[PDB]
Write a protein that binds this ligand. Structure first.
Ligand code: SAM
Ligand code: SAM
Ligand code: REN
Ligand code: REN
Lengths: 336, 336
């Protein structure tokens, strides 16, 4: 059975959830076999090769659809679930709190959020710390517009948004706190990225980075073999890197580490599960929202299949071995 | 059975090798239980606590005895064994070569070897690279005297030795290459140590560090519980730290990492095994050498028991799980 066959049945909804989960789990199993080496000597050789390799390197979903699929603040990153009964809305808030603690946010600081998405964290900080000035940076005009609208509705006067590709953005402005939440995965050139960030810091600044990781090894999000239909379906563009939990320790040319944590993968698994369940509940509504801007019911079904499969696959990835394979890494840095 | 009882029988040579090895292996087993955490979240918490804690912090054996126990150049660090039949002399040379490769030694460079011991590496570099100037730094007058004598005998004109406590040594001199071979384990204040080293480097310099490690966690070389008679016998002074293989990644305030390796622990195990076997072979000779400077046969037996037990214990430590627990870590750095 080829890619085309599985992809065919997937699109027609002919693959049940049990079989889909089983197939994706097997794909991730093969990645683990690829990544784990027999000795620490070999493991480090493998990891350092990856790190050395790094040092050499328009359609948007309507907001109404996003609101039907994601939690209240449309957080598009791993959330934090205290209980089995924690709702996605509660888990978003808990994550926001966690970032504020770990990044040592204090009232009165200037804060920059890089790749701020729909601006949940920006809005959280602005509301909690009235004397902070909070800037979001996004490459999406739609996202900028959404954040500014929300700030107006929430009577916030301390929010601004920079519309820019961060890799091209030039400014002399510095910030007390820089946050990068699950954005570094998309960065083509990390050494340059960290260098740029350092130029936006003073001696008093802190930088907080959160990224999806594997505990042991790094990998690009791409197919190992021909049997992997999943990786290329989800990200048809080789633009996602999954760093090991310790990978950023090797990128301290321009910044110095102060603290380092990981969050168990079950939190991410619970996040994607919540999105999948919410999308399922609002399926009829979702199809109606998407139809105008997509043109055909066939195109709508395609977009929905893609998002739903992402969630099903994410569940298998992050829940693997009770969250002890793929997880989230967090680091705090100061400037050199 | 108390410490005193086991220590009593040990001194009398009433504990056979099989029982001694078994007892020491069990002590190391308990360290592994102490060090390994159930989740990566907990593991990182444990490791970061250790790293944070660090950031807050006359009798010498005759040379004739050392020559009877150690290899030709009296290397007192892990050696590298290609074959099962590799001799300690061959393994010393192989290690020296390995350091020269990894530290990127080139003819004409100024080289500083910190805690140079009996100067095997200093002499190796001086002989192989005639245009290099090589400086050893040691806190031992006896060691300085030995190195200078050997340099004279080998017709080397490119060797000097600094007699200093490295933690107190002040100089404006800089070096193209700084080597630290199994000396950092003895350093009370590592952050300060690395800072000092950086002041002895230029933008063109490289720093190479080699240290005994555990792959996963850090620990002081000391007793966990009352059942551990071994740790305090070997090092009656809490002056030895076993860093994790990645611990130095968190000490990049003043230097930046370029490469990182580990060497499997079986090499160290083979090293201590070779020393133990050589001491055993030259036992009668060793006792005769030690007698003058120690005063009594009882004092001689004590010193020999201590060294022999160190080797027996080292074997159990480094061979644990086929060398995949305790091993040797190596790192290459440049200056900020
Ligand atoms: C996975 S989302 C995480 C969003 C947000 N931090 C959150 O936690 O919900 C990463 C974001 O980075 C943005 N992004 C990617 N590449 C970018 C670039 N070069 N410049 C600016 N933003 C970028 C994407 O548009 C996306 O919204
Ligand atoms: C374990 S030996 C390794 C010796 C040598 N590098 C080798 O590979 O054989 C570490 C050496 O560091 C020396 N040392 C320890 N503390 C020192 C200090 N504060 N200043 C200078 N040397 C020191 C010890 O005397 C010892 O010879
Ligand atoms: C469709 O839009 C998205 C919505 C939510 C996410 C969550 C998360 C994430 C989750 C995954 O499981 C994954 O696969 C390894 C990749 C990524 C990329 C980084 N990102 C923060 C990513 C998106 O692209
Ligand atoms: C008696 O003099 C010594 C001779 C040889 C060594 C080898 C090695 C080493 C080997 C071990 O197995 C060990 O225990 C964990 C500690 C150490 C300290 C660092 N050092 C480089 C150390 C000595 O102190």
């Amino acid at each position: 059975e080829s890619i085309g066959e599985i992809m065919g049945k997937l699109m027609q909804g002919e693959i049940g959830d049990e079989e889909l989960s089983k197939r994706i789990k097997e794909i991730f199993g093969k990645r683990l076999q690829w990544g784990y080496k027999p000795t620490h000597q070999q493991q480090l050789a493998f990891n350092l090769d990856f790190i050395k390799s790094l040092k050499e390197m328009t359609y948007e979903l309507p907001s109404a659809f996003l609101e039907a699929a994601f939690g209240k603040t449309i957080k598009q990153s791993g959330c934090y679930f205290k209980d089995e009964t924690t709702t996605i809305d509660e888990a978003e808030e808990a994550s926001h709190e966690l970032y504020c603690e770990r990044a040592q946010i204090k009232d009165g600081q200037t804060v920059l959020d890089i790749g701020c998405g729909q601006g949940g964290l920006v809005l959280h900080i602005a509301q909690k710390y009235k004397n902070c000035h909070v800037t979001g940076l996004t490459n999406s005009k739609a996202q900028k517009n959404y954040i500014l609208m929300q700030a107006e509705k929430l009577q916030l006067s301390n929010v601004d948004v920079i519309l820019a590709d961060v890799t091209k953005h030039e400014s002399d402005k510095t910030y007390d706190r820089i946050l990068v939440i699950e954005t570094i995965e998309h960065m083509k050139n990390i050494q340059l990225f960290m260098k740029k960030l350092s130029t936006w810091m003073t001696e008093d600044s802190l930088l907080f980075v959160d990224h999806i990781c594997h505990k042991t090894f790094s990998h690009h999000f791409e197919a190992i073999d021909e049997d992997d239909w999943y990786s290329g379906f989800i990200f048809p563009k080789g633009c996602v890197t999954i760093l090991s939990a310790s990978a950023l320790l090797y990128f301290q040319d321009d910044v110095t580490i102060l603290d380092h944590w990981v969050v168990n993968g079950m939190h991410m698994a619970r996040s994607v599960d919540a999105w999948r369940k919410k999308l399922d509940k609002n399926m009829e509504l979702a199809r109606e929202i998407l139809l105008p801007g997509l043109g055909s019911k066939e195109a709508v079904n395609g977009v929905i299949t893609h998002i739903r499969t992402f969630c099903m696959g994410g569940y298998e990835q992050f829940s693997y071995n009770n969250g002890e394979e793929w997880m989230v890494a967090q680091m705090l840095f100061k400037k050199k």
